[PDB]
Amino acid sequence: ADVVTYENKKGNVTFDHKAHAEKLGCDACHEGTPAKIAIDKKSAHKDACKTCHKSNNGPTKCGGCHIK
Ligand code: HEC
Ligand code: HEC
Ligand code: HEC
């Protein structure tokens, strides 16, 4: 939408949608027609959030995405 959170026992991940859309484009996460994704811990840590977020900010194990 514009912002969503993936709630999880860990520490609810609030993820930029709007922001990431304007700064990055769309391509970032959706090539063709969007609809949803559902980024789970798997994809998230593997090839969704993480693949961009490889060498972004100072690494600090976690914290980057989970507000926990
Ligand atoms: C990665 C950082 C994203 C960017 C950049 C954009 N979108 Fe996205 N979108 C993303 C996810 C993870 C999801 C699913 C949310 C969930 O709860 O699993 C979505 C979903 C949409 C949807 C479906 C309706 C909704 O969930 O709001 C649409 C219509 C959509 N996205 C469109 C869209 C467009 C047009 C963007 C580029 C201009 C865009 N998204 C960027 C992740 C990301
Ligand atoms: C590469 C195209 C990206 C993808 C895919 C995701 N993120 Fe991202 N993120 C990206 C950049 C370049 C930035 C900086 C934005 C700016 O305008 O400066 C970010 C930042 C965030 C943040 C804030 C981090 C901070 O420094 O406070 C969050 C919370 C965040 N991103 C979360 C996030 C999640 C959970 C994603 C997967 C759904 C994700 N991002 C993908 C670039 C990219
Ligand atoms: C953004 C680049 C992230 C960083 C930094 C870390 N995590 Fe993450 N995680 C992220 C997302 C978008 C999601 C998907 C939503 C979901 O809840 O599946 C996750 C998910 C997890 C989970 C899920 C809960 C569970 O399986 O118990 C866990 C365990 C988790 N993340 C832990 C975790 C830790 C310990 C981190 C530092 C080593 C960490 N995450 C960083 C996004 C991001």
UniProtKB/Swiss-Prot annotation:
InterPro entries: Cyt_c_III, Multihaem_cyt_sf
Binding site for heme 1: 17, 26, 29-30
Binding site for heme 3: 45, 62, 65-66
Signal peptide: none
GO biological process: anaerobic respiration
Record's keyword terms, sorted: Electron transport, Heme, Iron, Metal-binding, Sulfate respiration, Transport
Binding-site residues for heme 2, renumbered to this chain: 20, 49, 52-53
Residue intervals passing through the bilayer: none
Keyword Oxidoreductase belongs to the record: no
Keyword Chloroplast found: no
Processing after translation: Binds 3 heme groups per subunit.
Molecular-function annotations in GO: electron transfer activity; heme binding; metal ion binding
Function recorded in the entry: Participates in sulfate respiration coupled with phosphorylation by transferring electrons from the enzyme dehydrogenase to ferredoxin.
Protein name per the record: Cytochrome c3
Organism of origin: Desulfuromonas acetoxidans
Gene: cyd
